[PDB]
């Protein structure tokens, strides 16, 4: 949020130039400031419009956010830190699984209005088996490639 | 009675005590979730038979 | 330093933009020149959080190295000008627009040090080209040598990176909606990290290869120290424990698949149940598509 | 802006006089030289199949807040599909429903011009629910 | 998993054949409430 404003000669407005404070700006409409913009836009100031100038040198500068020549791919988490991770998740899989069977028996015997408003204990449904598998997998696959890649790279 | 994982040897009298590592849970669990997932699939079969 | 009072130098984006704006302020015919400013920031541990900086009139001969000028009076005026606007803004160092180090630098480091001990250099680039960050941080330490040469003011490298605030975050966010980088999801993001990492190792090693080739022939006097370290490198390469390592690495992979297998499987079942849901919604939509 | 209009308005099939420069024109961070950088293509290939030059300008036109590419990338179609004023309803339909007020506007001037010579009602059945879109 | 999403695509398609820009009179009624709301706030300001 960033606007711009310029006062307008309120005196000249009273004198008949009230429909004569219209400089030719484009437009795009505002509201929540209609508080003081109803005599702001239409008595005290008006709305200028904002732009930017996205240089290519500044853009190639900010674009930087990671120095990776020591980050991933030249590293990999600890292989005893990484089994303790799998352990936990793939057990949570079990807990959620059971509730998943209990949800597939319910949904069958109910109309979508009652499965719609079902927002008590979101732990039951698909949403958490997906939430998991995509972290688990991710991890691991790549978990996966990192080991292999280094075997040839630092061969 | 599983109190020290060894193997007694007769004919030479050597009480060999090989060291045994623990059966990792990352499989036992996955045995249980594959197990469970079947049950799901079955009930899912009965939901399949109703719409078509 | 040996002191744990410096380590992570973290420069916020508006500084980067600030030196890249300063490099075009001077930029008339005085360009192609090292330009220098002072770094304002705060810090309280192993960090030197850089936040603000402002050019200081600076000149330097283009063939000599003892003919450098830096209006330190200008500093003792401005430093107070900005203090009068924000408390907690000491002088945590000073930046020098690269492209790399100059013999003259150490001299400067002592006319900036008359304010704050621990001052650091932060070489920032005026040309995007590197694939790592354009922000290298050095400290002015001194040491003794096994060869018996007099103590020296060298320069020692400390790890570096850039961070941000909510403000900073949001401004940058706003400026990169042209070059979208968010269309790219997690998995691929990290594969990118692992290819882009080799893109680093490759050129670093490449630079060492050009150096070794530089002293061997086209002579450039040997500096025993470099070659020293370069030996530790080739002893540390993972080799001598070959067979055993093989038999283990294979096993840990095996595990990795076991869990991937499970993952992809659950994923499949869930997606398929999604499909059943579509089919049944379609039948009941077909009873409505008739009627009247 | 008045030079952009003056480079565009002079092409009638002579082909690549400033199109050969399009790889640089459409590469300048300036909006005047990307909009012109697609107008000249609009008028030199009038009456033919300029598909690849509205497509490149939807996924990027929604990234350049400048409608200099949102409005024109679509008001383009109003000429390259002037020949047959009865394929226009089939390829600006994908393009008025889509969010992005600028895109709607451009599609409405893509119809305004070319399907006025035939006054076809597949344009009108599509134009009416665009008259009802909220943004002024 | 790629296969059965690639065939799941068709059920959503019959629904898209059903309008997904419908109830235009609701939106037009809302638009006729924003001209009463705009001026409701110029009358709560009490400022011309």
Curated annotation (Swiss-Prot), chain A:
UniProt entry tagged with the keyword Transport: no
Portion held of the full protein: 156 to 310 of 310
Phosphothreonine modified-residue sites: 111
Subunit comment: Component of the 19S proteasome regulatory particle complex. The 26S proteasome consists of a 20S core particle (CP) and two 19S regulatory subunits (RP). The regulatory particle is made of a lid composed of 9 subunits including PSMD4, a base containing 6 ATPases and few additional components. Within the complex, PSMD4 interacts with subunit PSMD7 through their respective MPN domain. Interacts with TXNL1.
Gene Ontology CC annotations of this record: cytosol; cytosolic proteasome complex; extracellular region; ficolin-1-rich granule lumen; nucleoplasm; nucleus; proteasome accessory complex; proteasome complex
Gene Ontology biological process terms from the UniProt entry: double-strand break repair via homologous recombination; double-strand break repair via nonhomologous end joining; proteasome-mediated ubiquitin-dependent protein catabolic process; protein deubiquitination; protein K63-linked deubiquitination; regulation of proteasomal protein catabolic process; response to ethanol; ubiquitin-dependent protein catabolic process
Name listed for the protein in its UniProt record: 26S proteasome non-ATPase regulatory subunit 14
Modified residue annotations for Phosphoserine: 69
Keyword tRNA-binding: no
Family: Belongs to the peptidase M67A family. PSMD14 subfamily.
Organism: Homo sapiens (Human)
Expressed in which tissues: Widely expressed. Highest levels in heart and skeletal muscle.
UniProt gene name: PSMD14
EC number per UniProt: 3.4.19.-
Swiss-Prot record, chain C:
Domain MPN: 9-144
Alphabetical GO biological process terms: proteasome-mediated ubiquitin-dependent protein catabolic process
InterPro entries assigned: EIF3F/CSN6-like_C (IPR024969), JAMM/MPN+_dom (IPR000555), MPN (IPR037518), MPN_RPN7_8 (IPR033858)
Keyword Acetylation: yes
Gene3D superfamilies for this protein: Cytidine Deaminase, domain 2
UniProt xrefs under Pfam families: JAB, MitMem_reg
UniProt keyword Coiled coil, yes or no: no
A GO-annotated cellular component: nucleoplasm
Keywords: Acetylation, Isopeptide bond, Proteasome, Ubl conjugation
Cross-link (Glycyl lysine isopeptide (Lys-Gly) (interchain with G-Cter in ubiquitin)): 180
Superkingdom, taxonomy of origin: Eukaryota
Stated family: Belongs to the peptidase M67A family.
Oligomeric form and interacting partners: Component of the 19S proteasome regulatory particle complex. The 26S proteasome consists of a 20S core particle (CP) and two 19S regulatory subunits (RP). The regulatory particle is made of a lid composed of 9 subunits including PSMD7, a base containing 6 ATPases and few additional components. Within the complex, PSMD7 interacts with subunit PSMD4 through their respective MPN domain. Interacts with TRIM5.
Protein name, as recorded: 26S proteasome non-ATPase regulatory subunit 7
Organism encoding this protein: Homo sapiens
Gene name in the database record: PSMD7
From Swiss-Prot, chain D:
Taxonomic path: Eukaryota, Metazoa, Chordata, Craniata, Vertebrata
Stated family: Belongs to the proteasome subunit S1 family.
Gene encoding the protein: PSMD1
Functional note: Component of the 26S proteasome, a multiprotein complex involved in the ATP-dependent degradation of ubiquitinated proteins. This complex plays a key role in the maintenance of protein homeostasis by removing misfolded or damaged proteins, which could impair cellular functions, and by removing proteins whose functions are no longer required. Therefore, the proteasome participates in numerous cellular processes, including cell cycle progression, apoptosis, or DNA damage repair.
Subunit record text: Component of the 19S proteasome regulatory particle complex. The 26S proteasome consists of a 20S core particle (CP) and two 19S regulatory subunits (RP). The regulatory particle is made of a lid composed of 9 subunits, a base containing 6 ATPases and few additional components including PSMD1. Interacts with ADRM1. Interacts with ZFAND1.
Section covered of the full-length record: 546 to 681 of 953
Record protein name field: 26S proteasome non-ATPase regulatory subunit 1
Domain of life, per lineage: Eukaryota
Ranges: PC repeats: 2-35, 36-71, 72-104, 106-136
Originating organism: Homo sapiens (Human)
Swiss-Prot record, chain E:
Source taxon at top rank: Eukaryota
Comp. bias intervals (Basic and acidic residues): 15-39
Transmembrane intervals: none
Region (Disordered): 14-48
Family per similarity comment: Belongs to the proteasome subunit S3 family.
Self-association state and partner proteins as the record states: Component of the 19S proteasome regulatory particle complex. The 26S proteasome consists of a 20S core particle (CP) and two 19S regulatory subunits (RP). The regulatory particle is made of a lid composed of 9 subunits including PSMD3, a base containing 6 ATPases and few additional components. Interacts with UBQLN1 (via ubiquitin-like domain). Interacts with ERCC6.
Function: Component of the 26S proteasome, a multiprotein complex involved in the ATP-dependent degradation of ubiquitinated proteins. This complex plays a key role in the maintenance of protein homeostasis by removing misfolded or damaged proteins, which could impair cellular functions, and by removing proteins whose functions are no longer required. Therefore, the proteasome participates in numerous cellular processes, including cell cycle progression, apoptosis, or DNA damage repair.
Name of the protein described by the UniProt record: 26S proteasome non-ATPase regulatory subunit 3
Species whose genome carries this gene: Homo sapiens
Gene that specifies this protein: PSMD3
Complete-protein stretch covered: 487 to 534 of 534
